[PDB]
Design a protein around this nucleic acid. Structure first.
Ligand SMILES: [Mg+2]
Ligand SMILES: [Mg+2]
Ligand SMILES: [Mg+2]
Ligand SMILES: [Mg+2]
Ligand SMILES: [Mg+2]
Ligand SMILES: [Mg+2]
Ligand SMILES: [Mg+2]
Ligand SMILES: [Mg+2]
Ligand SMILES: [Mg+2]
Ligand SMILES: [Mg+2]
Ligand SMILES: [Mg+2]
Ligand SMILES: [Mg+2]
Ligand SMILES: [Mg+2]
Ligand SMILES: [Mg+2]
Ligand SMILES: [Mg+2]
Ligand SMILES: [Mg+2]
Ligand SMILES: [Mg+2]
Ligand SMILES: [Mg+2]
Ligand SMILES: [Mg+2]
Ligand SMILES: [Mg+2]
Ligand SMILES: [Mg+2]
Ligand SMILES: [Mg+2]
Ligand SMILES: [Mg+2]
Ligand SMILES: [Mg+2]
Ligand SMILES: [Mg+2]
Ligand SMILES: [Mg+2]
Ligand SMILES: [Mg+2]
Ligand SMILES: [Mg+2]
Ligand SMILES: [Mg+2]
Ligand SMILES: [Mg+2]
Ligand SMILES: [Mg+2]
Ligand SMILES: [Mg+2]
Ligand SMILES: [Mg+2]
Ligand SMILES: [Mg+2]
Ligand SMILES: [Mg+2]
Ligand SMILES: [Mg+2]
Ligand SMILES: [Mg+2]
Ligand SMILES: [Mg+2]
Ligand SMILES: [Mg+2]
Ligand SMILES: [Mg+2]
Ligand SMILES: [Mg+2]
Ligand SMILES: [Mg+2]
Ligand SMILES: [Mg+2]
Ligand SMILES: [Mg+2]
Ligand SMILES: [Mg+2]
Ligand SMILES: [Mg+2]
Ligand SMILES: [Mg+2]
Ligand SMILES: [Mg+2]
Ligand SMILES: [Mg+2]
Ligand SMILES: [Mg+2]
Lengths: 61, 246, 49, 92
RNA sequence: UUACUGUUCCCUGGGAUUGGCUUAUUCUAACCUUGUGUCAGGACCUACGGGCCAAGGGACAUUCU
RNA sequence: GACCAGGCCCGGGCGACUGUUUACCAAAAACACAGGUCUCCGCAAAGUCGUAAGACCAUGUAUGGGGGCUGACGCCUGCC
RNA sequence: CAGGGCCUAAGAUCAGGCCGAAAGGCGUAGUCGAUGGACAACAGGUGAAUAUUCCUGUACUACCCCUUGUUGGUCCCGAGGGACGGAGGAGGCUAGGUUAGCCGAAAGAUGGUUAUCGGUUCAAGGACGCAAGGUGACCCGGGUAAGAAGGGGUAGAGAAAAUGCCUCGAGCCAAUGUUCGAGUACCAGGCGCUACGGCGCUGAAGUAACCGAUGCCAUACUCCCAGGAAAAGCUCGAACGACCUUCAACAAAAGGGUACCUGUACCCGAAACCGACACAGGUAGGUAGGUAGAGAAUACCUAGGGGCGCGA
RNA sequence: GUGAAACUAAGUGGAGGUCCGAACCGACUGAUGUUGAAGAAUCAGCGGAUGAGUUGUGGUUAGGGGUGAAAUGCCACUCG
């Protein structure tokens, strides 16, 4: 009854991940504001992979 | 009952940064905070004792007080107290246990506790179980007395204090039978530095049970651990000291 | 004179007794609903399992 | 006095639905199917049908599809008849 | 680590912050500490804090060089 | 009568014991442990983290807090 | 129903304020923040795929209207309450199970036999109320004066509250239970049709005893030390201050009417999540049958789901 | 039992870092596998199992660092 060593992604809720890697979290600090500057010049489509809305089909509750 | 609340500083040992400053704090059973009155304001009113409750946040018991105006307070538990005893805070109060008054109106050689160093802050000294401070003498502006540590400090005369010795003197007599009783209080296991590695403590390395291997025992932060007096030289309270403890 | 007090006292207790049991009944519904086992239509199907 | 949101009231109803199940629902429940805006509500839709066709709405139920398109079940009062209103539009 | 050269914590002196009367001790006015003392706006600050008035220290110490 | 369902005894070394430890070769005689001892700290406390403001210690006050060594208990713990 | 429109913990931000090369850091009220608190529904039926969501029946919450009465209210503010541990076992109930009885059907090619097979069911909620259970002062059953739950009055800075004093009060506590809900509804079986799907009629009996919970009464009781969240909703009430007003506001019963946003599919002890695989693995929580058994172990079975995706 | 105690026999009570033993958490021995079914697992036994217990959800501590019942162990299969 022990998980293997490689299970680093235990299917955590998207609510907590947005509070740790979301759009609002990046725009708070100066580094995150520069982080998006790098990804826009890079031309990435999805700027923040770990983000979800507060409602809709994506809502964790 | 209303004096009890659950608003306490959770996260013991951790500072605002969240790093461990006071080590070996954690776990332990939950405990609510009691509001004890150390200033002993609301003078010239009688109040009787009804309960002798358990205070997890200290070594001594407490006592519930009921005044004629309906107010309710907590105080420490003196030694020979019994339910029904009265207590008063004032100036011309008779000198018996449980009462509070300044040091000017006290005679010499009194058993005193719950002493305050400054007016308004409330009592700070002699709070623990079985604590007592003996008043030696007084001279003009201030008054000297003895503390439980054996030191003779010079306290101002207008400071308030309570008469008697603190309750439950027999608390050292019981020995904690096992380690689980220690963790219930919130004290984690203490590791010896001589077992660690050199990067963690100056005593670390060496095969087998290594000796100190150093000119003196040292703290985890390099300074010695024995003999070096830590009192700040030229402190503001340096003139109020008559002698050193022993 | 005293019958007024005794008569009104029982009615005062009956209303509180009436609301008090209704209070304990709904909290029992909210309790097992959080557990996920309240609806008897779902329980009778899982009586022998 | 304020609505919840502000937008074109005449956009609340894009078009009805034409399916064998929807037509089957008209005769059994006296209901009607309508695709609605995502920003719509049961109040605006209730007020809407009351003004277009001049009929009473017993109840409104809605849902959002996976494609981000909202659907609206509209049950009329038994006094009126959804089948009669259906023929007025053209669909059966 | 009792290897070389250095940094930091800490101790000490000179100078600034810093003043008065006496023969180094005292004084209060800078400065330090405290108030569940008090006043304050539409309202609260017994929520830190601000103003005022007091209390304990006191030209020491803290701070800079 | 199936499945299920303790092998036991004598003696010795280490550690008192329940527990913790090198995720992926080491579960131990290592660590921790209750207790014992030394030393520091009179609260604006020592100590600890910070450039500083300040925070923890503590909404605690020497029967308390921090640190070093030893490690139940029993007999002892010498000389420089 | 779940979450939000209500509350707050951990913790994160922080008006001003303090500190600091910059970025920024510390920090007060305040605001965010469920893993908690608070708050109103069940049964049956329908069925390509959804239903406590649609239909039927019976309820609940909030608001509004209506009818009288009251005629100063609503916030701020004060107080109560919410409000809580572990361990242990006893008692009173129920779920559930077994058997019996009742009803219906049955010959299952054997030596005998009906001893066989099936059914015997129903909620939320409303109304009433309880012991031989637990509790509540008085004795070795009776008597008696204070005394429980639960109320009232009074004094002081003093409305409520708190404290003190005085006074009424043998009954209280709640799981269960009774009745309505609850209809020849549901149902075995039988009578006919068929494209074999189900449809259409009919539809009896629907009781008791024993066993008995890890669930309910129950933060009920006892013991112990490590001494067991907060806020709001709710309830009571004066003054100061603020807003509004003769109904245009508060309050009571019946009746009537009205009813926001998002999630709802499907898998979930897994082939759909996490392991690069249709991977002998990991994945919180709920429901907990029959025989033997101390037992949720173990063995064989029911409901139900499967025979493991190369074979001979 | 005594002057009163100390002491002492029954019953009640149900304490424990108590015992056996599933779930749950662990990983002592051996076999198997070792271009594995699996980048640490399967099988058979084994330890704890009311406690210093296990676990979910939501959070905190970030590299001249943190954390560590202390192995230089862990900090996204990566750690002198
Ligand atoms: Mg598990
Ligand atoms: Mg080592
Ligand atoms: Mg070193
Ligand atoms: Mg060494
Ligand atoms: Mg050696
Ligand atoms: Mg079963
Ligand atoms: Mg919906
Ligand atoms: Mg002030
Ligand atoms: Mg103030
Ligand atoms: Mg065995
Ligand atoms: Mg040998
Ligand atoms: Mg050992
Ligand atoms: Mg062991
Ligand atoms: Mg290993
Ligand atoms: Mg071992
Ligand atoms: Mg090993
Ligand atoms: Mg070790
Ligand atoms: Mg300090
Ligand atoms: Mg040792
Ligand atoms: Mg709800
Ligand atoms: Mg600012
Ligand atoms: Mg704050
Ligand atoms: Mg809030
Ligand atoms: Mg929740
Ligand atoms: Mg809600
Ligand atoms: Mg389905
Ligand atoms: Mg309370
Ligand atoms: Mg036969
Ligand atoms: Mg009054
Ligand atoms: Mg659904
Ligand atoms: Mg579904
Ligand atoms: Mg599971
Ligand atoms: Mg699996
Ligand atoms: Mg793999
Ligand atoms: Mg069974
Ligand atoms: Mg089994
Ligand atoms: Mg089988
Ligand atoms: Mg096959
Ligand atoms: Mg396969
Ligand atoms: Mg296969
Ligand atoms: Mg045990
Ligand atoms: Mg065991
Ligand atoms: Mg391990
Ligand atoms: Mg195994
Ligand atoms: Mg086992
Ligand atoms: Mg064993
Ligand atoms: Mg054992
Ligand atoms: Mg970082
Ligand atoms: Mg770097
Ligand atoms: Mg690693």
């Amino acid at each position: 009854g022990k998980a293997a060593l490689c299970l680093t992604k235990r299917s955590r809720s998207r609510k907590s991940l947005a509070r740790t890697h979301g759009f609002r979290l990046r725009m708070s600090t100066t580094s995150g504001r520069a982080l998006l500057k790098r990804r826009r010049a890079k031309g990435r489509k999805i700027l923040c992979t770990k983000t979800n809305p507060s409602s809709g089909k994506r809502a964790s509750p | 009952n209303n004096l009890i609340s659950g608003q306490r500083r959770c996260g013991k040992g951790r500072n605002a940064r969240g790093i461990i400053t006071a080590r070996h704090r954690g776990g332990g059973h939950k405990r609510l905070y009691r509001k004890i009155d150390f200033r002993r304001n609301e003078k010239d009113i009688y109040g009787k004792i009804v309960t002798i409750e358990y205070d997890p946040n200290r070594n001594a018991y407490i006592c519930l007080i009921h005044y004629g105006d309906g107010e309710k307070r907590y105080i420490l538990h003196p030694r020979g107290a019994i339910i029904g005893d009265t207590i008063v805070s004032g100036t011309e109060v008779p000198i018996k246990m449980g009462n509070a008054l300044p040091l000017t109106d006290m005679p010499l050689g009194t058993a005193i506790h719950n002493i305050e160093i400054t007016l308004g802050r409330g009592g700070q000294l002699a709070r623990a179980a079985g604590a007592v401070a003996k008043l030696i003498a007084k001279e003009g502006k201030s008054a000297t007395l003895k503390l439980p540590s054996g030191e003779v400090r010079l306290i101002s005369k207008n400071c308030s204090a309570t008469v008697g010795q603190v309750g439950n003197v027999g608390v050292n007599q019981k020995r904690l039978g096992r380690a689980g009783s220690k963790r219930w209080l919130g004290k984690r296991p203490v590791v010896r530095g001589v077992v660690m590695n050199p990067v963690d403590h100056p005593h670390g390395g060496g095969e087998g049970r290594a000796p100190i291997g150093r000119k003196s025992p040292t703290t985890p932060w390099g300074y010695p651990a024995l003999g070096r007096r830590s009192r700040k030289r030229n402190k503001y309270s340096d003139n109020f000291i008559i002698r050193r403890r022993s | 004179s005293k019958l007024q007090l005794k008569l009104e006292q029982k009615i005062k207790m009956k209303m509180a007794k009436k609301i008090r049991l209704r209070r304990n009944r709904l909290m029992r519904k909210r309790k097992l609903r959080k557990r996920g086992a309240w609806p008897p239509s779902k329980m009778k199907k899982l009586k022998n399992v | 006095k304020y609505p919840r949101r502000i937008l074109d009231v005449y956009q609340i109803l894009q078009s009805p639905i034409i399916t064998e199940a929807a037509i089957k629902n008209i005769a059994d429940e006296n209901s009607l199917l309508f695709t609605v805006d995502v920003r719509a509500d049961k109040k605006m839709i209730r007020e809407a049908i009351s003004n277009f066709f001049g009929v009473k709405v017993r109840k409104v139920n809605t849902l959002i599809r996976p494609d981000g398109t909202k659907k609206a079940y509209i049950m009329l009062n038994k006094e009126y008849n959804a089948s009669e209103l259906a023929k007025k539009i053209g669909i059966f």
